[PDB]
Amino acid sequence: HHHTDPMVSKGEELFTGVVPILVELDGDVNGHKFSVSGEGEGDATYGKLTLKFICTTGKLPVPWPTLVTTLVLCFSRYPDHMKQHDFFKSAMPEGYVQERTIFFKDDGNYKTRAEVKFEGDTLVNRIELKGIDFKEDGNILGHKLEYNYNSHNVYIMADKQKNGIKSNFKIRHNIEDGSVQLADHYQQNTPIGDGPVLLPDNHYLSTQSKLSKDPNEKRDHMVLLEFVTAAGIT
């Protein structure tokens, strides 16, 4: 609402209230083609997301928790003293590309590319996902993961050469038998536009996610509440 840096003001202004979100994913995992649509709202003031996702092609062929990181970090809450480090909002409204490779230990990998940008007043995240080399009897295609999600801190670093950011981090998915399925993420983000962006000092994001079901919904779906806060600069 009041920042002495006009570049920060420009990005904050687009995220000042509740912003509607649309998520589209087209996926192919070991030749099972599927699509997911999601709708909800983001409130960057509190770092809060609320989304509901539907598999529009029938039953989702992989477990919903494996898609949480893939299915909008511009809604992170950056403390006032860290707002000059917020790459994600500084790239708006033209947006950014978010690319990942996700390696599931002892199993296959996801390769994702997403464009995150405004269409009018709506923040859209449009994703293509390709998954290969998964085991039919593994934890992913065998749906052995529990329907829950662990809190996680992720380290963000600038990539000055690409005018973007980079991160590598591990997600632990609980398996029904009490064990864990590791998912190693590599991520890079680059701006879509050619204007300047804020390139951050090293810092981390703290995330927490809660998964639930809509008791009146017959389609395969996931309801997601996420909180993300930046930290690590004193």
Swiss-Prot record:
GO biological process, one term: generation of precursor metabolites and energy
Result for mutant: S37R: In mut1.28; shifts fluorescence lifetime from 3.03 to 2.76 ns. In mut2.2; shifts fluorescence lifetime from 3.03 to 1.94 ns. In mut3.3; shifts fluorescence lifetime from 3.03 to 1.88 ns
Record Pfam families: GFP (PF01353)
Uses, biotech or industry: Green fluorescent protein has been engineered to produce a vast number of variously colored mutants, fusion proteins, and biosensors. Further generation of mutants led to more stable proteins (at 37 degrees Celsius for example) with brighter fluorescence and longer fluorescence lifetimes.
Domain of life: Eukaryota
Record key words, sorted: Chromophore, Luminescence, Photoprotein
Effect of D107E: In mut1.27; shifts fluorescence lifetime from 3.03 to 2.85 ns
Annotated consequence of substituting Q84R: In Azurite; shifts the excitation and emission spectra to shorter wavelengths and increases quantum yields compared to BFP
Documented effect of changing I175V: In EBFP1.2; shifts the excitation and emission spectra to shorter wavelengths and increases quantum yields compared to BFP
Family per similarity comment: Belongs to the GFP family.
Description of post-translational modifications: Contains a chromophore consisting of modified amino acid residues. Maturation of the chromophore requires nothing other than molecular oxygen.
Assembly and interaction partners: Monomer.
Phenotype when changing K166Q: In R10-3; matures to the red-emitting state with excitation and emission maxima at 555 and 585 nm, respectively
Effect of V197A: In mut1.5; shifts fluorescence lifetime from 3.03 to 2.72 ns
InterPro entries membership: GFP, GFP-related, Green_fluorescent_prot
Tissue expression as described in the entry: Photocytes.
Known outcome of mutating M157T: Increases fluorescence at warmer temperatures such as 37 degrees Celsius
Free-text function comment from the UniProt entry: Energy-transfer acceptor. Its role is to transduce the blue chemiluminescence of the protein aequorin into green fluorescent light by energy transfer. Fluoresces in vivo upon receiving energy from the Ca(2+)-activated photoprotein aequorin.
Mutagenesis or variant effect for S206F: In H9; increases fluorescence at 395 nm excitation
Protein name: Green fluorescent protein
Reported impact of V180A: In mut2.1; shifts fluorescence lifetime from 3.03 to 2.50 ns
Phenotype for V154I: In Azurite; shifts the excitation and emission spectra to shorter wavelengths and increases quantum yields compared to BFP
Effect of N109T: In EBFP1.2; shifts the excitation and emission spectra to shorter wavelengths and increases quantum yields compared to BFP
